[PDB]
Amino acid sequence: KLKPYVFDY
Amino acid sequence: EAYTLSTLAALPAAEIVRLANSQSSSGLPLPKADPATVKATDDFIDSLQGKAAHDQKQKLGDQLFKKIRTFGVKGAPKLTIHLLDSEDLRALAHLMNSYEDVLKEKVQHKVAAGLNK
């Protein structure tokens, strides 16, 4: 999950 | 001391915002903030208090990542992570929503150091 933070686009 | 955009962007977000909010904003290269925007930003950050650090940074990061993508800068996830890990979350959010030009310049400082690679 939020382990690093995850930004998809 | 007249800051340029570049020297201002070199300060931490919390200090940029402190200067913006000081009555003595004698010549700072910042626009006047919209109070409704400021309140919406503070309410959003208020809603993150008490959550796990990863979740706070994910939630602000979602918006900050989109903002950096609109700047046209490659490596936006790594820049977003670096900013979330080096800046006060509330002040960083205010740069994102009210001071986009100084945020882009801060991002340029990061690109110049390779932090987007």
From Swiss-Prot, chain B:
UniProt effect for mutating residue 65 to A: Leads to a reduction of RNA-binding
Summary of the knockout phenotype: Reduces filamentous growth and virulence. Disturbs polar growth of filaments.
Subcellular location: Cytoplasm, Cytoskeleton; Endosome
PABC domain segment(s): 40-117
Protein family membership: Belongs to the polyadenylate-binding protein type-1 family.
Subunit structure: Part of large ribonucleoprotein complexes (mRNPs) containing RNA-binding proteins RRM4 and PAB1, endosome-binding protein UPA1, core scaffold protein UPA2 and associated factor GRP1. Interacts (via PABC domain) with UPA1 (via PAM2 domain).
Protein's job: Key RNA-binding protein involved in the formation of polar-growing hyphae which is essential for infection by the plant pathogen. During filamentation, assembles into particles that shuttle bidirectionally along microtubules to both poles. The RRM4 transport particles are part of the endosomal mRNP transport that regulates polarity of the infectious hyphae by transporting distinct mRNAs encoding, for example, the ubiquitin fusion protein UBI1, the small G protein RHO3, or the septin CDC3, from the nucleus to cell poles.
Record note on domains: The RRM1, RRM3 and PABC domains are important for RNA_binding and polar growth. RRM3 recognizes the specific binding motif UAUG of cargo mRNAs.
Protein name as it appears in the record: RNA-binding protein RRM4
Organism, scientific name: Mycosarcoma maydis (Corn smut fungus)
Full-length numbering of the shown residues: 676 to 792 of 792
